[PDB]
Amino acid sequence: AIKKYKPITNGRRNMTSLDFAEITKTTPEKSLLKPLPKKAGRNNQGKLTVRHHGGGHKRQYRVIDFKRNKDGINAKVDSIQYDPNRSANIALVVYADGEKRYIIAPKGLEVGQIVESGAEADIKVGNALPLQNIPVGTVVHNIELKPGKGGQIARSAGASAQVLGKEGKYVLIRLRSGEVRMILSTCRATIGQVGNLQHELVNVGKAGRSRWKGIRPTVRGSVMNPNDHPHGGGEGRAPIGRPSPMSPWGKPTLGKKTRRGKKSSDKLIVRGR
Amino acid sequence: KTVVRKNESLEDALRRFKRSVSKSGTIQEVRKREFYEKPSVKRKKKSEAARKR
Amino acid sequence: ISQERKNEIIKEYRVHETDTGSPEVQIAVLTAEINAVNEHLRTHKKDHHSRRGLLKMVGRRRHLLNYLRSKDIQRYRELIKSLGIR
Amino acid sequence: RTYEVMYIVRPNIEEDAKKALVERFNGILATEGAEVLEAKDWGKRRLAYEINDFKDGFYNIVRVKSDNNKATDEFQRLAKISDDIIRYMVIRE
């Protein structure tokens, strides 16, 4: 799955890439495409609010069915396709009635596999059921937090969570972070693990390839001026020179917890990551 | 589980208890697994003890 | 391989009826068995113990094929094209 | 190949549901090129040890003949998912 480039140039030295063997169709479905103009970390005011976003390759948005709310109709996987907007691959599925939707491609999903959603669906990869119907110990992905909203958790390449137990209206789940939390039993989840597992292993290789992905350079605070950053200034190279390392906006940035208190989810969370 | 018999001494029951423990061999097992013995050593002890038996 | 399949192979390559020991019969069965273990090894690549059996079977086939070429070259040439071994 | 399957059903199951359960699972064992030679209910028996906090279980034994292990695979998969089937074992012979 990982291809290692030969060192023909210093740029290509130690660079690796995905083979894309899993991809079956190279072109997206026209009906499910929407425009996605780049924001480059700029908000409604027109001001930068998130650093290091800019440029990158032009991309089209593929509409994905995170909800998986079409029940009682079997769907056949037509193809696995590349999606530039996410780490995982996506699968075009054709329902019996002729409706075509994109879903997150699970690991081990194949062309011609049948996928179904509903309470009566079987526990097989690519099937979407309410957490109630899913047995303990099943690895799942695309988990909803609010019923009918659509999956928000365990969507990244190789993402998964395990059902641990049932507690009345809520089901206990262990997340990839390692956090164990309660999720409403009515919320749906899809069976299996997200595919494209080798994504993390990719060695980008050169600065330019980061630029293609719309990542702008990160300047360290220590090589800035004092007016720019609390790490700024000092004659020659300087150590942090402060009790804590600090963010560019003057907040301690190593070990300091930023989770807000008095949140509704606090009761739902059983064990932190 | 040894149960004290009617018109039987606790000391008499204790005799019965001790014998049942011996047959169970729970004491024997506990001593063996006090400290780790490397696989080869374990096999040797099994053989020579059987040679004694 | 199944005794049924083996028996089918003997009938296809038996020099005479009642022949079970001719190089042709022995080679043919060996060829089937080598392929079956090669199939096993494709799924099970770390079954080193089974691969050793396969190596012995390949050598036994080679030695019989050596003997047959020595004795009858036509019989050899016919067998190798039939079994697709070379 | 003849396979003998033994499964225990939870003691708290309703009788009508239990009948539906056995029908499903004994049906599975005849799904693919497989024939159920015999199916027998041993009935409720005390378990030697507690399984899933149950001290008793309804024991069912089925004997099945097939040229594949697809039916026995489907049984074991579905027996794992089921909360009714507390224990199961497939034996070739």
Binding site: - | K23 | - | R45, A48, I61, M89
Partner: protein, 63 residues
């Protein structure tokens, strides 16, 4: 002693046959050594797989 299985001409041990198996296990549920029982080598092996299969299905106790 004497091998029960040889004497009684029994060649297959069923894990489902609890009553037979209970005779060859101790009060603690431990499998009895073949010296004490007098079982043959071939049948000690057969019986013992049967006991382990029976214990799996909770027909016999582990302890």
């Amino acid at each position: 002693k004497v091998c029960y299985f040889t004497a009684n001409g029994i060649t297959h041990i069923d894990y489902k046959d609890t009553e037979l198996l209970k005779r060859f296990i101790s009060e603690r549920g431990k499998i009895l050594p073949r010296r004490v029982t007098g079982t043959s080598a071939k049948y000690q092996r057969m019986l013992t797989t049967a006991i382990k299969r029976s214990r799996h299905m909770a027909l016999l106790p582990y302890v």
